[PDB]
């Protein structure tokens, strides 16, 4: 008879009641109840519909209950959100990240022969030789069917001047929920979590001595921050995050929901990790920022800690409307950094001391 | 040496008397107040809508319209040359008129299986059953490619949640000028005015107890104000009007011309009744506002009076230049409420105690 | 065993729930086996694709026998639905003639069409005219159009025929058929029809009653819903159209029921397919008269009017070593006549008087 106070409890409650909510919803996530336009502190399951019609034009069989109970007597609220399923910045930071700098690092532009992207972090393989490289999104890194994919910065040789970074070695795709979350967050045989990743070691002839580990526009970042499923709920949802992109530069935002699910028509259930909406009714990211690091804003004057990377373009998928008298605002979807570094056995490099010593 | 134009009727027949030279090089013609230097004056005139207003140095005398016309009994009036061509709001009212409220009324969103529209008002038929329904335009109501077209609010069941309102009962199509105005306004055997409208009865099992007469943004409206065609010209032209729409919310405007006539290539001459332009170069209605009530803004502190409804959502039909320091601004066309209340015989409900009878 | 149409629609109405699960439509006719029609009454089930009964779930295998009230049984057939001629007749039906008649080209300001038969209202003034399809006759937002032959004055030389007076919209099956053919509150039997009176100043002396290319037709033939099944299904039909000219065909099925994703049930009356793997009407023959081929030295009798515009649309795909064939939909010209209360002037004596 207790109230949910962690992400695991809400995820288990949604798993118990997966069939009721999905009947008239375009998606479902777990977070904080949104009332009168801003987050409250009451845990709730956020269900996503296409329109919020007053419950006077709804038959009784379409009015979702506001309270659900799960295993062991855990209850939580139900909140209904109105979901929906090119302004490039010009500044001194975008120019440097697009290749007008003397060094490469996080937020820099990485390109293939066909698509652009954004450099993520500078990572390290935890096993074997422990080569040095970087990690990004495979939708900009791996072309489905050319046999080899090479990395160039800023542009490929067939499009402009650039240098050859490396080749894709390991790439990730949708994985089962059991390995990712550790629980059965659903009643479907085929539930996959989309977490793109790509480890590209630097070439043996590369000039790696002109790379940096500090984030341009954020300063110095700390060690990676893992997301625990049984921690207080106000530790992930409702916090302040930032991003450095090649197209939009430094942008700020906040975390709105966790564990977004889509349920395509063919029957496969796809989970999306994080939901980020920009601040001051701005956009958190453009299209082309896929790969940029997502870092929590420093609190009580500590070192900011990356918590994930941007999946890609969410404008095509749609936007969301927070209860207000203003127009809808788009969102941004992320991926957990911890279980994307564990699945690839990668280590975050924050300073040059761990870079110089491990380049041997 | 005679009398000057001083009203709408019998000085609009002056255009009928001279409908031979007016439309040779013009896209249309209306009657109202002369516009000079961008402001509306008080001299009655006949506005001539051309697609390009050049200075009188590059015109042969053939296409130079005179500034004075004559009619029956020695009546004269001026001639005006006007340049004339032929994304919803996000606020709280817009949200309340699309299903976020607990009541329905004028300005509410009414939808069919294909189109979108706005609720006109709450009405009663003056004979027979006397059931309380509502009225709108038919470009949203009727379809002749379906036997039944039903109304849902906010959305049809095949597009989203909603409630069933009713079906179309009466919708008079384009109607001739003789019964509408009374005068033979034109020398064309086939002259029609597009008085689109549709009376839609409420469902038998529809909850009446959740509908209202409040305009939701104008306050309380009075009895319908008929456009009497024997009053001075300063009774319709130049007054302030307003509307409530599902897309554009609540806006305001002014009346510039009356009885705008349009002739197509096939030969049929079509009259449009009311010309409205926005204030401060703002728009008066978006696309999807067709069927919204047009209400005169009340002066001297009386109750506002509805005088018409919006014909169609304008984005393609209308652009006119008033001043030579700003770009063209679109206009909105309306239909008289009071002769559309006669061919669709009705009675407007203005209080909440006329809903319980 | 059913031996008529009346008890053939009744079984489908009784079993209109299991059939609609995996079908694009349903009609009543004769069983088709190996590409030819048999003499066994059956119910045609129009699926999107034919597969062998081994890649199908047990609930997706439609039974071959259904029963209805009164202990009457019928077979079930599964069909695979897939929902200008240059001659001297096409020229004479397009404006080169010295007279107007059946099969002539009639045009509105927007669309083209085809004249049907010369008709006469049975009450009131009894003034002559003609009847055709309203998707040519009526422009909806302008009810009473003017009729011109061959072309409107804004498109070419022509003469003014008249203006539409009465037009037929969707009709419910209660008045049309008589039986409640369907357990659906909204079942519509949308028979196109439009009587266009001739103008008072029309010459009328240049109007014929013989069908160009068929000769002299007899009186109209009504379709009785309870008769021997080989009286309508399996017969030979023909037409005279403005676009394709004379063309022969064969009636395939009766009372076709197509569906739309709105919940409202519709009905189509007559199914016709071409002969020798040809097309029955290409485009613009909407309104052409459907006439049974003369049998045993008789006079051909009109039995329907083409709905039209179903060549670049519906294909009657067969699973017997060939490409899809085109089907044409028609409407019974006995009830289109009755509910508009008209006649059929078959000879010159009834036109003059
Ligand atoms: N399937 C549905 N589609 C559209 N609207 C619905 C549906 N189900 C419920 N609603 C409406 O959603 C309303 C509640 O949204 P919500 O759950 O957030 O309440 P809230 O947070 O208290 O209020 P607020 O709207 O102020 O954010 C319900 O009370 C009902 O009016
Ligand atoms: N067919 C035409 N096309 C373009 N311009 C025309 C045409 N006919 C007349 N004009 C010119 O329009 C000008 C007159 O406009 P108007 O009729 O408004 O007078 P006005 O009200 O005194 O001036 P304004 O409104 O511009 O201050 C004259 O130069 C007139 O010749
Ligand atoms: N829903 C369906 N979709 C596709 N195919 C089906 C379906 N149901 C049945 N079938 C196949 O259709 C076959 C029969 O078609 P039909 O009913 O006409 O038999 P038939 O006339 O004896 O043979 P023929 O195919 O020679 O015309 C079934 O026996 C089965 O093989």
CB distance A80 to A64 below 8 Å: yes
CB distance A257 to A237 below 8 Å: yes
Atom of ligand 1 nearest to the CA of A66: 17
Asked if B99's CB is within 8 angstroms of A57's CB, the reply is yes
Helices (H), A166-315: 177-180
For a ligand 1 pocket test, name from A51, A62, A80 the mutation site with the most ligand atoms within 8 angstroms of its C-beta.
A80
Chain B neighbors (3+ CB pairs < 8 Å): A, C
A325 to chain B, closest Cα gap in Å: 4
What's the token pair of residue A331? Answer: 């969102």
What's the token pair of residue C194? Answer: 């439009």
Minimum-distance CB partner of A50 among B92, B95, B160: B160
User: Phi-psi region for residue B99, left (φ > 0), alpha (ψ -120 to 50) or beta?
Assistant: left
Residues in chain C: 353
Rg of chain B over all Cα atoms, to the nearest angstrom: 21
Q: Are strands A306-310 and A329-336 parallel, antiparallel or unpaired?
A: antiparallel
Under 8 Å CB-to-CB from C51, ≥6 apart: which residues? none
Asked if B145's CB is within 8 angstroms of C188's CB, the reply is no
Minimum-distance CB partner of B161 among A57, A325, A327: A57
Burial B187-215 (b: 16+ CB within 10 A, else e): ebeebbbbbbbbbbbbbeebeeeebbbeb
Minimum-distance CB partner of C141 among B146, B158, B173: B173
User: Phi-psi region for residue C111, left (φ > 0), alpha (ψ -120 to 50) or beta?
Assistant: beta
Residues of chain A contacting residue B95, judged by C-beta atoms under 8 Å apart:
325
Beta strands in chain C (DSSP E): 25-33, 36-47, 65-68, 72-82, 118-120, 128-132, 146-150, 158-163, 166-168, 187-188, 193-197, 236-241, 245-258, 265-266, 268-274, 289-292, 302-306, 315-317, 325-332
**Cα gap A358→A85, rounded to integer Å:** 45
Q: Does A326 touch chain B (CB under 8 A)?
A: yes
Q: Are strands B3-4 and B75-85 parallel, antiparallel or unpaired?
A: parallel
3-state helix, strand, coil in chain A (%, to 5): 15, 35, 50
What's the token pair of residue C162? Answer: 């008249």
Residues of chain A contacting residue B161, judged by C-beta atoms under 8 Å apart:
51, 53, 57-58, 62
**Cα gap B103→B87, rounded to integer Å:** 25
Whether the CB of C295 sits within 6 Å of ligand 3: no
- Closest Cα to residue C270, out of C240, C299, C243, C310? C310
C169: nearest CA in chain B? B147
Q: How much distance in Å is there from the Cα of C166 to the middle of ligand 3?
A: 45
Q: Does C190 touch chain B (CB under 8 A)?
A: yes
**Cα gap C326→C317, rounded to integer Å:** 8
Asked if B153's CB is within 8 angstroms of A57's CB, the reply is yes
C/B Cβ contact: 3+ pairs below 8 Å:
yes
Chain A neighbors (3+ CB pairs < 8 Å): B
What's the token pair of residue A185? Answer: 């967050």
In three-state secondary structure terms, C95 is: helix
**How many CB atoms are closer than 10 A to CB A44?**
23
**How many CB atoms are closer than 10 A to CB A115?**
13
**Which DSSP string do the residues of C111-157 spell out, in sequence order?**
-B-----EEEBSSTT--EEEEE-HHHH--SSSSSPEEEEES-TTTSS
A316 to chain B, closest Cα gap in Å: 18
Within 197-236 of A, beta carbons closer than 8 Å to B belong to: none
**Cα gap A82→B160, rounded to integer Å:** 13
Q: How much distance in Å is there from the Cα of A236 to the middle of ligand 1?
A: 25
CA distances from residue A90 to A154, A244, A246, A248, A310 in whole angstroms, order as listed: 17, 14, 10, 8, 21
B170 to chain A, closest Cα gap in Å: 26
**Cα gap C283→C241, rounded to integer Å:** 10
Q: What are phi and psi of A252, to 5 degrees?
A: -115, 155
What pairs with residue B26 in β-bridges? none
C143: nearest CA in chain B? B173
- Closest Cα to residue A216, out of A100, A299, A126? A100
This structure's resolution (Å) is 2.9
**Cα gap B279→B331, rounded to integer Å:** 11
Mutate to test the interface with C, among B139, B144, B156, B265 (most CBs of C within 10 A): B144
**Cα gap C50→C44, rounded to integer Å:** 13
Residues of chain A contacting residue B210, judged by C-beta atoms under 8 Å apart:
56
CB distance B153 to B136 below 8 Å: no
- Closest Cα to residue B348, out of B86, B105, B50? B105
Q: What are phi and psi of A80, to 5 degrees?
A: -105, 125
Minimum-distance CB partner of B265 among C141, C142, C154: C154
Atom of ligand 2 nearest to the CA of B36: 25
Q: Please identify which residue in the block is written with the tokens 């119910």.
A: C43
B139 to chain C, closest Cα gap in Å: 9
Nearest CA to ligand 2 atom 15: B81
Asked if B154's CB is within 8 angstroms of A51's CB, the reply is yes
Q: How much distance in Å is there from the Cα of B230 to the middle of ligand 2?
A: 29
**Cα gap C328→B3, rounded to integer Å:** 69
Helix (H) / strand (E) element for C89: namely helix C88-91
Distance of CA C240 to the CA centre of its chain: 14
Whether the CB of B234 sits within 6 Å of ligand 2: no
Q: How much distance in Å is there from the Cα of C78 to the middle of ligand 3?
A: 5
- Number of Cβ pairs < 8 A linking chain A and chain B: 33
Exposed / middle / buried, residue C46 (Cβ in 10 Å: 0-12, 13-18, 19+): buried
Residues of chain C contacting residue B266, judged by C-beta atoms under 8 Å apart:
109, 154
Q: Are strands A2-3 and A74-83 parallel, antiparallel or unpaired?
A: parallel
What's the token pair of residue B206? Answer: 């529809």
Q: What are phi and psi of B127, to 5 degrees?
A: -140, 170
Whether the CB of C202 sits within 6 Å of ligand 3: no
Whether the CB of B24 sits within 6 Å of ligand 2: no
B92: nearest CA in chain A? A325
**Cα gap B294→B277, rounded to integer Å:** 12
Burial C131-155 (b: 16+ CB within 10 A, else e): bbbbbbbbbeebeebbbbbbbbeee
- Closest Cα to residue B125, out of B341, B352, B338? B341
Q: Please identify which residue in the block is written with the tokens 């056995």.
A: A345
In three-state secondary structure terms, C281 is: coil
What's the token pair of residue B128? Answer: 């027979």
Whether the CB of C33 sits within 6 Å of ligand 3: yes
Minimum-distance CB partner of B90 among A51, A58, A326: A326
- Closest Cα to residue B24, out of B213, B281, B263? B263
Atom of ligand 2 nearest to the CA of B63: 1
- Number of Cβ pairs < 8 A linking chain B and chain C: 22
Within 87-106 of B, beta carbons closer than 8 Å to A belong to: 90-92, 95, 99-102
Q: Does A51 touch chain B (CB under 8 A)?
A: yes
In three-state secondary structure terms, B72 is: coil
Asked if B161's CB is within 8 angstroms of A325's CB, the reply is no
- Closest Cα to residue C152, out of C113, C99, C108? C108
- Closest Cα to residue A245, out of A91, A133, A123? A91
Burial C157-192 (b: 16+ CB within 10 A, else e): ebbebbebebbbebbebeebbebebbebeebbbbbb
What's the token pair of residue B103? Answer: 């009541």
**Cα gap A138→A153, rounded to integer Å:** 16
Q: What are phi and psi of B292, to 5 degrees?
A: -80, 140
CB distance A36 to A262 below 8 Å: no
Mutate to test the interface with C, among B137, B142, B146, B189 (most CBs of C within 10 A): B146
C192: nearest CA in chain B? B145
**Cα gap A109→A145, rounded to integer Å:** 23
B114: nearest CA in chain C? C262
Atom of ligand 2 nearest to the CA of B67: 17
DSSP secondary structure code for residue B354 in this structure:
S
**Cα gap A323→A36, rounded to integer Å:** 6
Beta strands in B96-215 (DSSP E): 109-111, 116-118, 121-124, 132-136, 150-154, 162-167, 175-176, 191-193, 198-200
Ligand 1 is surrounded, with C-beta below 6 A, by A 24, 34-36, 49, 51-55, 62-64, 79-80, 323; B 161
Q: Does C144 touch chain B (CB under 8 A)?
A: no
**Cα gap B125→B134, rounded to integer Å:** 10
**Cα gap A176→A184, rounded to integer Å:** 10
């Amino acid at each position: 008879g207790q109230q949910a106070n962690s992400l695991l409890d809400l995820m288990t409650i949604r798993a118990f009641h997966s069939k009721i909510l999905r009947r008239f919803s375009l998606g479902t996530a777990v977070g904080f109840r949104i009332r009168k336009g801003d987050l409250t502190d009451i845990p709730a399951i956020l269900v996503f519909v296409a329109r919020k019609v007053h419950k006077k034009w709804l038959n009784p069989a379409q009015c979702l209950p506001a309270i659900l109970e799960g295993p062991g007597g855990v209850w939580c609220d139900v909140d209904v959100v109105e979901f929906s399923y090119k302004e490039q910045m010009f500044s001194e930071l975008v120019d440097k990240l697009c290749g007008s700098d003397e060094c490469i690092g996080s937020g820099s532009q990485v390109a293939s022969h066909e698509t652009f992207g954004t450099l993520g972090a500078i990572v390290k393989r935890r096993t074997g030789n422990k080569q040095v490289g970087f990690l990004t999104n495979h939708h900009v890194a791996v072309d489905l069917d050319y046999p080899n994919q090479k990395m160039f910065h800023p542009l490929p040789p067939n499009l402009g001047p650039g240098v050859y970074l490396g080749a894709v070695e390991r790439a990730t795709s949708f994985i089962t929920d059991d390995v990712w979350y550790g629980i059965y967050a659903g009643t479907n045989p085929e539930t996959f979590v989309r977490a793109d990743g790509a480890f590209i070691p630097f070439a043996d002839d590369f000039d790696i001595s002109t790379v940096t580990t500090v984030v341009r526009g954020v300063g110095d970042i700390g060690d990676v921050k893992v997301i625990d499923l049984q921690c207080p709920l106000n530790s992930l949802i409702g916090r302040q995050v930032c991003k450095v992109g090649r197209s939009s530069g430094h942008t700020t935002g906040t975390v709105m929901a966790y564990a977004l699910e889509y349920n395509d028509e063919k029957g496969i259930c796809f989970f999306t990790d994080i939901l980020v909406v920009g601040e001051n009714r701005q956009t958190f990211d453009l299209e082309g920022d896929s790969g940029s690091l997502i870092i929590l804003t420093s609190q009580d004057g500590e070192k900011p800690r990356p918590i994930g990377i941007i999946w890609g373009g969410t404008a095509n998928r749609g936007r969301l409307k927070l209860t207000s008298d203003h127009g809808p605002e788009n969102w941004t979807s992320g991926v957990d950094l911890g279980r994307l570094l564990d699945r690839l056995e990668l280590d975050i490099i924050i300073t040059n001391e761990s870079l110089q010593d491990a380049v041997q």
